[PDB]
Design a protein around this motif. Structure first.
Motif, PDB file in Angstrom:
ATOM      1  N   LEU A 485       0.864  -1.201   0.000  1.00 45.29           N
ATOM      2  CA  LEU A 485       0.000   0.000   0.000  1.00 45.29           C
ATOM      3  C   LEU A 485       0.884   1.229   0.000  1.00 45.29           C
ATOM      4  CD1 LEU A 485      -2.930  -0.883   2.407  1.00 45.29           C
ATOM      5  CD2 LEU A 485      -2.779  -1.099  -0.091  1.00 45.29           C
ATOM      6  N   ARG A 486       0.294   2.391  -0.266  1.00 45.60           N
ATOM      7  CA  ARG A 486       1.012   3.682  -0.295  1.00 45.60           C
ATOM      8  C   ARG A 486       0.164   4.784   0.325  1.00 45.60           C
ATOM      9  NH1 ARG A 486       2.460   3.827  -6.541  1.00 45.60           N
ATOM     10  NH2 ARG A 486       3.667   1.936  -6.953  1.00 45.60           N
ATOM     11  N   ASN A 487       0.796   5.862   0.760  1.00 50.98           N
ATOM     12  CA  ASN A 487       0.090   6.971   1.436  1.00 50.98           C
ATOM     13  C   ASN A 487      -0.546   7.790   0.341  1.00 50.98           C
ATOM     14  OD1 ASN A 487       2.260   8.193   0.344  1.00 50.98           O
ATOM     15  ND2 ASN A 487       2.846   9.381   2.147  1.00 50.98           N
ATOM     16  N   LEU A 488      -1.185   8.887   0.727  1.00 50.29           N
ATOM     17  CA  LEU A 488      -1.945   9.733  -0.215  1.00 50.29           C
ATOM     18  C   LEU A 488      -1.019  10.569  -1.105  1.00 50.29           C
ATOM     19  CD1 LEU A 488      -4.690  10.676   2.348  1.00 50.29           C
ATOM     20  CD2 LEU A 488      -4.930   9.140   0.346  1.00 50.29           C
ATOM     21  N   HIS A 489       0.298  10.490  -0.942  1.00 53.13           N
ATOM     22  CA  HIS A 489       1.296  11.173  -1.812  1.00 53.13           C
ATOM     23  C   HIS A 489       1.927  10.141  -2.747  1.00 53.13           C
ATOM     24  CE1 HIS A 489       0.752  14.370   1.181  1.00 53.13           C
ATOM     25  NE2 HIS A 489       1.047  15.149   0.160  1.00 53.13           N
ATOM     26  N   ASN A 490       1.379   8.928  -2.767  1.00 54.84           N
ATOM     27  CA  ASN A 490       1.862   7.802  -3.605  1.00 54.84           C
ATOM     28  C   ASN A 490       3.269   7.366  -3.172  1.00 54.84           C
ATOM     29  OD1 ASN A 490       0.841   5.983  -5.324  1.00 54.84           O
ATOM     30  ND2 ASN A 490       1.311   7.112  -7.227  1.00 54.84           N
ATOM     31  N   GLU A 491       3.682   7.749  -1.959  1.00 54.97           N
ATOM     32  CA  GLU A 491       4.929   7.268  -1.281  1.00 54.97           C
ATOM     33  C   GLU A 491       4.682   5.865  -0.723  1.00 54.97           C
ATOM     34  OE1 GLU A 491       5.327  10.564   1.532  1.00 54.97           O
ATOM     35  OE2 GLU A 491       6.075  11.928  -0.108  1.00 54.97           O
ATOM     36  N   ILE A 492       5.620   4.928  -0.845  1.00 50.33           N
ATOM     37  CA  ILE A 492       5.585   3.610  -0.134  1.00 50.33           C
ATOM     38  C   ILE A 492       5.494   3.794   1.406  1.00 50.33           C
ATOM     39  CG2 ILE A 492       8.037   3.449   0.101  1.00 50.33           C
ATOM     40  CD1 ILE A 492       7.311   0.273  -0.823  1.00 50.33           C
ATOM     41  N   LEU A 493       4.553   3.086   2.012  1.00 50.89           N
ATOM     42  CA  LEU A 493       4.365   2.918   3.462  1.00 50.89           C
ATOM     43  C   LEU A 493       5.103   1.625   3.808  1.00 50.89           C
ATOM     44  CD1 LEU A 493       0.518   3.385   3.449  1.00 50.89           C
ATOM     45  CD2 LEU A 493       2.003   4.942   4.679  1.00 50.89           C
ATOM     46  N   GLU A 494       6.222   1.700   4.530  1.00 52.38           N
ATOM     47  CA  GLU A 494       7.169   0.549   4.548  1.00 52.38           C
ATOM     48  C   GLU A 494       6.505  -0.702   5.159  1.00 52.38           C
ATOM     49  OE1 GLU A 494      10.978   2.112   3.332  1.00 52.38           O
ATOM     50  OE2 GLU A 494      12.039   0.999   5.097  1.00 52.38           O
ATOM     51  N   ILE A 495       5.478  -0.592   6.005  1.00 55.47           N
ATOM     52  CA  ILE A 495       4.930  -1.808   6.678  1.00 55.47           C
ATOM     53  C   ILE A 495       3.493  -2.130   6.233  1.00 55.47           C
ATOM     54  CG2 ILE A 495       4.994  -3.112   8.806  1.00 55.47           C
ATOM     55  CD1 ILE A 495       5.694  -0.232  10.103  1.00 55.47           C
ATOM     56  N   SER A 496       2.746  -1.147   5.742  1.00 56.46           N
ATOM     57  CA  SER A 496       1.302  -1.317   5.459  1.00 56.46           C
ATOM     58  C   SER A 496       1.151  -2.143   4.177  1.00 56.46           C
ATOM     59  CB  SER A 496       0.650   0.023   5.370  1.00 56.46           C
ATOM     60  OG  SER A 496       1.106   0.903   6.385  1.00 56.46           O
ATOM     61  N   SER A 497       0.356  -3.211   4.168  1.00 54.57           N
ATOM     62  CA  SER A 497       0.050  -3.993   2.927  1.00 54.57           C
ATOM     63  C   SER A 497      -1.332  -4.694   3.017  1.00 54.57           C
ATOM     64  CB  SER A 497       1.115  -5.012   2.677  1.00 54.57           C
ATOM     65  OG  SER A 497       1.003  -6.059   3.659  1.00 54.57           O
ATOM     66  N   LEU A 498      -1.828  -5.267   1.896  1.00 51.68           N
ATOM     67  CA  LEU A 498      -3.007  -6.187   1.870  1.00 51.68           C
ATOM     68  C   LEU A 498      -2.571  -7.535   1.327  1.00 51.68           C
ATOM     69  CD1 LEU A 498      -5.474  -3.761   0.108  1.00 51.68           C
ATOM     70  CD2 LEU A 498      -5.187  -4.051   2.539  1.00 51.68           C
ATOM     71  N   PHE A 499      -3.195  -8.605   1.815  1.00 53.19           N
ATOM     72  CA  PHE A 499      -2.940  -9.987   1.350  1.00 53.19           C
ATOM     73  C   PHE A 499      -4.145 -10.366   0.502  1.00 53.19           C
ATOM     74  CE2 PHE A 499      -2.583 -14.689   2.387  1.00 53.19           C
ATOM     75  CZ  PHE A 499      -1.560 -14.921   1.519  1.00 53.19           C
ATOM     76  N   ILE A 500      -3.919 -10.800  -0.746  1.00 56.61           N
ATOM     77  CA  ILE A 500      -5.026 -10.933  -1.755  1.00 56.61           C
ATOM     78  C   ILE A 500      -4.846 -12.197  -2.585  1.00 56.61           C
ATOM     79  CG2 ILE A 500      -5.439  -8.475  -1.849  1.00 56.61           C
ATOM     80  CD1 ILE A 500      -4.072  -8.419  -4.599  1.00 56.61           C
ATOM     81  N   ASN A 501      -5.963 -12.723  -3.056  1.00 56.96           N
ATOM     82  CA  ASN A 501      -5.991 -13.817  -4.044  1.00 56.96           C
ATOM     83  C   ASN A 501      -6.613 -13.200  -5.286  1.00 56.96           C
ATOM     84  OD1 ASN A 501      -5.311 -16.461  -4.780  1.00 56.96           O
ATOM     85  ND2 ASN A 501      -7.250 -17.331  -4.152  1.00 56.96           N
ATOM     86  N   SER A 502      -6.131 -13.570  -6.471  1.00 57.15           N
ATOM     87  CA  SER A 502      -6.824 -13.277  -7.733  1.00 57.15           C
ATOM     88  C   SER A 502      -6.774 -14.534  -8.593  1.00 57.15           C
ATOM     89  CB  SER A 502      -6.277 -12.068  -8.392  1.00 57.15           C
ATOM     90  OG  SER A 502      -4.956 -12.293  -8.892  1.00 57.15           O
ATOM     91  N   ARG A 503      -7.793 -14.661  -9.441  1.00 59.20           N
ATOM     92  CA  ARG A 503      -7.978 -15.788 -10.377  1.00 59.20           C
ATOM     93  C   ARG A 503      -8.532 -15.186 -11.661  1.00 59.20           C
ATOM     94  NH1 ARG A 503     -12.067 -19.632  -7.624  1.00 59.20           N
ATOM     95  NH2 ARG A 503     -13.096 -17.742  -6.877  1.00 59.20           N
ATOM     96  N   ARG A 504      -8.281 -15.823 -12.801  1.00 66.33           N
ATOM     97  CA  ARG A 504      -8.766 -15.366 -14.118  1.00 66.33           C
ATOM     98  C   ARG A 504      -9.190 -16.594 -14.916  1.00 66.33           C
ATOM     99  NH1 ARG A 504      -6.829 -14.934 -19.364  1.00 66.33           N
ATOM    100  NH2 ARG A 504      -7.831 -13.271 -20.571  1.00 66.33           N
ATOM    101  N   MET A 505     -10.312 -16.477 -15.629  1.00 70.31           N
ATOM    102  CA  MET A 505     -10.912 -17.575 -16.406  1.00 70.31           C
ATOM    103  C   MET A 505     -11.270 -17.065 -17.808  1.00 70.31           C
ATOM    104  SD  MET A 505     -14.042 -19.972 -15.176  1.00 70.31           S
ATOM    105  CE  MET A 505     -15.381 -18.991 -15.867  1.00 70.31           C
ATOM    106  N   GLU A 506     -11.400 -17.983 -18.762  1.00 66.45           N
ATOM    107  CA  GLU A 506     -11.894 -17.701 -20.132  1.00 66.45           C
ATOM    108  C   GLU A 506     -12.722 -18.892 -20.623  1.00 66.45           C
ATOM    109  OE1 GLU A 506      -8.604 -15.538 -21.823  1.00 66.45           O
ATOM    110  OE2 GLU A 506     -10.007 -14.316 -23.063  1.00 66.45           O
ATOM    111  N   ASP A 507     -14.059 -18.775 -20.572  1.00 67.75           N
ATOM    112  CA  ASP A 507     -15.049 -19.767 -21.093  1.00 67.75           C
ATOM    113  C   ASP A 507     -14.948 -19.867 -22.625  1.00 67.75           C
ATOM    114  OD1 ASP A 507     -16.790 -20.865 -18.879  1.00 67.75           O
ATOM    115  OD2 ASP A 507     -17.200 -18.742 -18.487  1.00 67.75           O
TER     116      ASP A 507
END
Ligand SMILES: [Ca+2]
Length: 609
Positions: A485-507
């Motif tokens: 994650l980053r602060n409102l100045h688009n600077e890196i926040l050295e400890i703040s993050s999110l843990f995420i899953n993503s998946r993509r499909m094509e029928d």
């Protein structure tokens, strides 16, 4: 007790979309399983599998590792988005606040390639820069040009375009021209440079061809037809006596590839013409003439800038303009707002050099959707979109200095209207330090080439945004990943993050093939893992392209002398699903049909007929 190599490979292929060799996986175990007797038997422990994915170097963005591609920089200048600054000399408000010379240095160091001088008369016969008829402070024209010379090519050697808003006399417009030549020297384009510029149907030259070059964008004097016309016009001027309309020839002669013209609608060849529209006129143009604006931006550069109404130096959303292939979307770099962050996410691509090749539907004739695509239209019933799943599992330190805030995550899909949609998690009560949501959003997308994922952290009480991150959709890596994650100045926040899953499909046909070209397909590297390959290891990796087909992969595996086909296998958590693969079938299309976390892992297998 732990996870084998065969089973850690199925997880990496299927969830993480990483095709590793037998040895690279034995390496991941060695690096994350401390217990040596486990390590010696090729088993990653359950706590070690968790350590492997929770690792801080399991980042989301592919753009960490992106660099300039020389080939991608070898097409005309007008086929590119070009990172651009509006009124670069301004620090804050449009009518109050300071002008700063350094701001040109900072912006250009960042990788910006277009900047703006607003040149006016100084009381000592030297041009000055400031916002006309306002309480902005004035900065010397010469100081600014020196700042550009020093800093233009430090970060990126790709050409800059100086946007001159010329309000000087002819005397001080000549000063301007001396100073451009004396300071930039042989970097300043002062003549047509290329064999291709004297051809039957000329195009702008490639940003590659123009390395370490400075292009002026000013008005250019129209060529008079005869000696007599010049003298007659001169007699007219005399006869009545008792931006600025006149243009010093000294300065006009330095305008080559970027000849500013009041916009003509939809004798120097037209690819050297460039226009500058306030955001309102450019939006009118995008609603009314969608497909015409796209055919126009294929051959010519167009520049949008913020409306005059935005005196607080707010910024317009760049997406509207980029989807019609407008190249120069000029933002106020001094205002941290969602659009400036959208800008930054776009120009991470191609090494952050500030020139990004456009989605090929807006220039490549061999794209199935060339001239059929309008980005403001909903009726894409011809095609089947890609299915994205995004799980927000959890966060860390998501509101700095507020342990006891109640956060939720806003996720915004930003693209053409049809692809656009908003999500928001439940608020976690009084835990910003290690909140867990485990909330999932589904969304479909047709135009993958220009969707942006915006993650924002919102403190539910104050409804304030505490952290933010924007990532191009195509840049997001599949699977379990950490999102810095980053602060409102688009600077890196050295400890703040999110843990995420993503998946993509094509029928009907898949969107990503309808918006593609056979040239981009065959140049996109993809890896495939294949089990059952005669050899030591039980599965081998192969380098292929999104265009490679079953018959081609078979020849690649087998060509080395000692009646085989590939099999699509699904193993469950039963008896495995088995489908013989058709000789003429696209391989990468099969890997993209698979969806993880649905009780199977996909393999491709070699079988004797
Ligand atoms: Ca201006």
């Amino acid at each position: 007790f732990g996870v084998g190599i065969l089973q850690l490979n199925d997880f990496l292929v299927n969830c993480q979309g990483e095709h590793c060799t037998y040895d690279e996986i034995l390496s991941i175990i060695q690096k994350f399983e401390p217990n040596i007797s486990m390590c010696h038997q090729g088993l990653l422990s359950f706590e070690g599998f968790a350590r492997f994915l929770m690792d801080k170097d399991n980042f989301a963005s592919k753009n960490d590792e992106s660099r300039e591609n020389k080939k991608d920089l070898q097409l005309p200048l007008s086929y590119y988005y070009i990172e651009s600054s509006h009124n670069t000399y301004l620090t804050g408000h449009q009518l109050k606040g300071e002008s700063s010379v350094e701001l040109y240095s900072q912006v250009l160091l960042q990788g910006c390639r277009s900047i703006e001088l607003d040149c006016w008369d100084g009381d000592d016969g030297m041009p000055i820069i400031y916002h006309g008829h306002t309480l902005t402070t004035k900065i010397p024209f010469k100081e600014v040009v020196e700042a550009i010379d020093r800093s233009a090519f430090i970060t990126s050697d790709l050409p800059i375009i100086i946007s001159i808003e010329n309000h000087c006399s002819l005397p001080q417009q000549r000063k301007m021209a001396e100073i451009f030549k004396s300071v930039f020297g042989e970097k300043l384009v002062a003549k047509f440079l290329f064999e291709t510029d004297f051809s039957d149907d000329p195009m702008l030259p490639s940003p590659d061809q123009l390395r370490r070059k400075v292009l002026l964008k000013n008005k250019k004097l129209k060529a008079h037809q005869t000696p007599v016309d010049i003298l007659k016009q001169k007699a007219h001027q005399l006869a009545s006596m008792q931006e600025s309309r006149q243009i010093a020839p000294e300065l006009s002669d330095l305008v080559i590839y970027c000849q500013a013209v009041k916009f003509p609608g939809l004798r120097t060849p037209k690819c050297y013409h460039i226009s500058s529209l306030n955001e309102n006129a450019a939006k009118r143009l995008c609603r009314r003439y969608s497909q015409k604006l796209i055919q126009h931006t294929a051959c010519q550069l167009l520049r949008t800038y913020p409306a005059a109404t935005r005196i607080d130096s707010s910024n317009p959303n760049p997406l509207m303009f980029w989807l019609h292939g407008i190249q120069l979307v000029a933002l106020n770099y001094q205002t941290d707002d969602l659009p400036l962050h959208l800008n930054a996410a776009m120009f991470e691509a191609n090494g952050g050099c500030g020139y990004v090749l456009k989605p090929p539907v807006l220039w490549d004739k061999s794209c199935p959707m060339y001239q059929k695509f309008s980005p403001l239209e909903r009726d894409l019933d011809a095609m089947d979109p890609a299915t994205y799943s995004l799980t927000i599992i959890s966060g860390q330190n998501v509101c700095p200095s507020n342990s006891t805030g109640s956060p939720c995550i806003e996720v915004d899909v930003l693209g053409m209207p049809l692809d656009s949609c908003h999500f928001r998690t439940k608020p976690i009560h009084r835990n910003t330090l290690n909140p867990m949501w485990n909330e999932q959003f589904l969304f479909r997308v047709h135009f993958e080439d220009l969707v942006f994922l915006r993650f924002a952290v919102v403190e539910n009480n104050s409804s304030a945004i505490t952290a933010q991150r924007i990532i191009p959709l195509k840049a997001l890596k599949r699977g379990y990943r950490h999102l810095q994650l980053r602060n409102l100045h688009n600077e890196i926040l050295e400890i703040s993050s999110l843990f995420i899953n993503s998946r993509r499909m094509e029928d009907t046909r898949p969107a990503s093939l309808m918006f593609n070209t056979e040239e981009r397909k065959c140049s996109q590297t993809h890896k495939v893992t294949v089990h059952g390959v005669p050899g030591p290891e039980p599965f081998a990796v192969f380098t292929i392209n999104e265009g490679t087909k079953a018959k081609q992969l078979l020849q690649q595996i087998l060509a080395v002398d000692q009646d085989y086909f590939l099999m699509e296998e699904k193993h469950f958590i039963k008896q495995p699903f088995q489908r013989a693969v058709g000789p003429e079938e696209d391989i990468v299309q099969i890997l993209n049909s698979w969806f993880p976390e649905e009780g199977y892992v996909g393999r491709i297998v070699l079988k004797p007929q």
